[PDB]
Amino acid sequence: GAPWWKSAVFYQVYPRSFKDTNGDGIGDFKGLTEKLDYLKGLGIDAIWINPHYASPNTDNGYDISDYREVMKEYGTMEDFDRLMAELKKRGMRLMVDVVINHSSDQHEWFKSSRASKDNPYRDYYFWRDGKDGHEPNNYPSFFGGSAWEKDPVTGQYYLHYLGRQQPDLNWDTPKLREELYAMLRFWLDKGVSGMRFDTVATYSKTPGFPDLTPEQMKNFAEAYTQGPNLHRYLQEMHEKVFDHYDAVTAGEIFGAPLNQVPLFIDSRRKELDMAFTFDLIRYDRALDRWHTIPRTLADFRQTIDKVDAIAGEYGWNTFFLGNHDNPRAVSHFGDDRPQWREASAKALATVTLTQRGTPFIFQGDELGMTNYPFKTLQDFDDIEVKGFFQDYVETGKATAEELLTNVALTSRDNARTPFQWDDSANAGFTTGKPWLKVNPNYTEINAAREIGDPKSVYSFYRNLISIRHETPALSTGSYRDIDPSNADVYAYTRSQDGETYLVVVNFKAEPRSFTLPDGMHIAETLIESSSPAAPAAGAASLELQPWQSGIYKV
């Protein structure tokens, strides 16, 4: 038998933006608990929640000031316990986010570490002398300026790959590793079923902190994944923690070269169970992370083919088209214009739910939610956009208007607007003022209207999820791309135990034809979207409407 997580469908909840129950404009645990029936009815097996720990929220939960306490905005430990109990009543599982590349600068470890050079917490973090009058080296931060921040108390700099208020934890220090392992056991003893490791590839730092070369500077995210002790630390964590439990582990392998991914997920290596990779989701992103570079379906499918190959026999991939760090799937990979939004969102649901891997549906994608119409830079909450303002606008590299036009397409805030529950005030998300503005298209895109309509995006996701659950080949079967060079129609097979299925997805807003491989014929149509008629049993070809998708037994 294959482990449960290989055939599960996960849903990602960004709790801040899912459901508010107390008018403060921020989503909370009670809100999520009240919506479990909605997720159960969609067919979700497991939920991954973004970080839910005590946090000053300079990066919305990813700056944690106490790993053993819940975030004040989300509720109390009792609320979290109640969430767990209600998930369990429904046979559902919880995956939590684990953020141990860095902590908050408000964490008591860091308050102590920074206080002097000779204290027991000094080497919980990285403290270094500046060089030639400036920073220890030329490392940049993802969130703006240098990755090194001076502390006048000791006159040394501390390292922060992310924000200034997210100092990196020092995995080279054994006592620090032991603290992290104990903290993980604290949550696993509560029964959590999965853990997702934020920026898991950056834990090991390079000895001596030499300068990056000019080449490396342009792709610094990759350099940060090349620490010599990385796999040693991941293997130790598995031996001391995950060997004692029955939880699934998944790594956000951001910035690593694709050919190193098997090191994290080959089951023989006893590291992680599954990979989140970013080759596909960043396939059309410029190196600066805020421009977009036009790509075609041939690029999209060739990337998938490569990622599939690296899982091979002993590894396992997740599959996702959206998360809390990226623009909305239908806007990014589909066509979000009024006339094409529903058809292309369905086509993308078909893709997501028929890939070899564990699919993750990002909250609101089952409604066909879109990017937000930002008008000014003040419409963004996101600290990454403030950092681009700092690195590009303040330095005269770009104008504010150039930053705005381009980041409107790429910003994480596109994924973070409140979930659209119905057409009441604030889309039923809150009775107060939402922390981030609700998209005005909530009058046309909302759960209440979608659930009631058999022809909706929600209904199609629901139907695909049943089909996947009922068809073993569609989770664990082999994957074969019929024609990796085709830039119009995406077609592939899934097969297991002598049964083969064909998936065919038109990525053009125009009619297209499709010819099956010589010798292959349609046996049955499981489901189609935007199609006037199923093919005839025995068909050797298909006539596709704009954005038509389908699954066929062959």
Q: Provide the annotated active-site residues.
A: 198, 252
Give every CB contact of residue 540 below 8 A, 6+ residues apart in sequence. 515, 516, 520, 521
Q: Which is nearer to Ca ion, 24 or 222 (CB)?
A: 24
Q: DSSP label at 535?
A: P
How many helices and strands, by DSSP H and E, does the chain display? 18, 20
Give every CB contact of residue 539 below 8 A, 6+ residues apart in sequence. 516, 521, 522
Q: What whole-number distance in Å separates Cα of residue 140 and Cα of residue 221?
A: 9
Six token digits for residue 411: 């910003």
Confirm or reject binding of residue 22 to Ca ion (CB under 5 A): yes
Q: How far is the CB of 73 from Ca ion (least distance, A)?
A: 6
Six token digits for residue 2: 């294959």
Q: Are 480 and 492 in contact (CB under 8 A)?
A: yes
The alpha carbon of 259 is separated from its chain's Cα centroid by a whole number of angstroms, namely 20
Q: Give the 3-state secondary structure of residue 30.
A: helix
Instruction: Please identify, among the stretches 13-21, 147-155, 223-231, 491-499, the one whose residues bind Ca ion according to the rule CB under 5 A.
Output: 13-21
Confirm or reject binding of residue 28 to Ca ion (CB under 5 A): yes
Confirm or reject binding of residue 20 to Ca ion (CB under 5 A): yes
Ligand-binding annotation for 465, yes or no, is no
Q: How far is the CB of 75 from Ca ion (least distance, A)?
A: 8
Ligand-binding annotation for 172, yes or no, is no
Q: Which is nearer to Ca ion, 78 or 510 (CB)?
A: 78
Site string for Ca ion, 237-266 (x = CB under 5 A): ------------------------------
Q: Are 371 and 409 in contact (CB under 8 A)?
A: yes
Q: What whole-number distance in Å separates Cα of residue 171 and Cα of residue 102?
A: 10
Ligand-binding annotation for 22, yes or no, is yes
The separation between the first and the last C-alpha atoms of the chain, rounded to the nearest angstrom, is: 25
Instruction: Please identify, among the stretches 16-24, 276-284, 387-395, 500-508, the one whose residues bind Ca ion according to the rule CB under 5 A.
Output: 16-24
Instruction: Please identify, among the stretches 26-34, 47-55, 95-103, 287-295, the one whose residues bind Ca ion according to the rule CB under 5 A.
Output: 26-34
Ligand-binding annotation for 28, yes or no, is yes
Site string for Ca ion, 145-184 (x = CB under 5 A): ----------------------------------------
Instruction: Please identify, among the stretches 24-32, 190-198, 408-416, 531-539, the one whose residues bind Ca ion according to the rule CB under 5 A.
Output: 24-32
User: Residues in contact with Ca ion, total (CB under 5 A)?
Assistant: 5
Q: How far is the CB of 98 from Ca ion (least distance, A)?
A: 24
Q: How far is the CB of 6 from Ca ion (least distance, A)?
A: 35
Q: Which is nearer to Ca ion, 29 or 278 (CB)?
A: 29
DSSP H/E element including 344? helix 341-352
Confirm or reject binding of residue 24 to Ca ion (CB under 5 A): yes
Q: Smallest Cα–Cα separation from 327: which of 340, 336, 318, 317?
A: 336
Q: How far is the CB of 24 from Ca ion (least distance, A)?
A: 4
Site for Ca ion in 273-332 (CB under 5 A): none
Q: Which is nearer to Ca ion, 18 or 139 (CB)?
A: 18
Q: What whole-number distance in Å separates Cα of residue 153 and Cα of residue 291?
A: 39
Tokens 């270094």 sit on residue: 128
Q: What whole-number distance in Å separates Cα of residue 48 and Cα of residue 410?
A: 23
Q: Which is nearer to Ca ion, 22 or 154 (CB)?
A: 22
Strands (E) across 398-463 are located at none
Chosen residue from 26, 71, 221, 474 binding Ca ion by CB under 5 A:
26
Q: How far is the CB of 166 from Ca ion (least distance, A)?
A: 24
Ligand-binding annotation for 24, yes or no, is yes
Q: How far is the CB of 22 from Ca ion (least distance, A)?
A: 4
Instruction: Please identify, among the stretches 14-22, 256-264, 374-382, 395-403, the one whose residues bind Ca ion according to the rule CB under 5 A.
Output: 14-22
Instruction: Please identify, among the stretches 25-33, 184-192, 373-381, 506-514, the one whose residues bind Ca ion according to the rule CB under 5 A.
Output: 25-33
Q: How far is the CB of 53 from Ca ion (least distance, A)?
A: 16
Q: Which is nearer to Ca ion, 24 or 172 (CB)?
A: 24
Q: What whole-number distance in Å separates Cα of residue 180 and Cα of residue 466?
A: 39
Length of the chain, in residues: 554
Report the 10 Å Cβ neighbour count for 244.
Answer: 11
Q: Which is nearer to Ca ion, 81 or 305 (CB)?
A: 81
Q: Which is nearer to Ca ion, 22 or 302 (CB)?
A: 22
Q: What whole-number distance in Å separates Cα of residue 168 and Cα of residue 217?
A: 19
Quick one: 291 exposed, middle or buried, by C-beta within 10 A (0-12, 13-18, 19+)? middle
Q: Are 345 and 530 in contact (CB under 8 A)?
A: no
- State the pairing for strand pair 156-159/127-128: antiparallel
Contacts with Ca ion by CB under 5 A lie at 20, 22, 24, 26, 28
User: Residues at the annotated binding site for Ca(2+)?
Assistant: 20, 22, 24, 26, 28
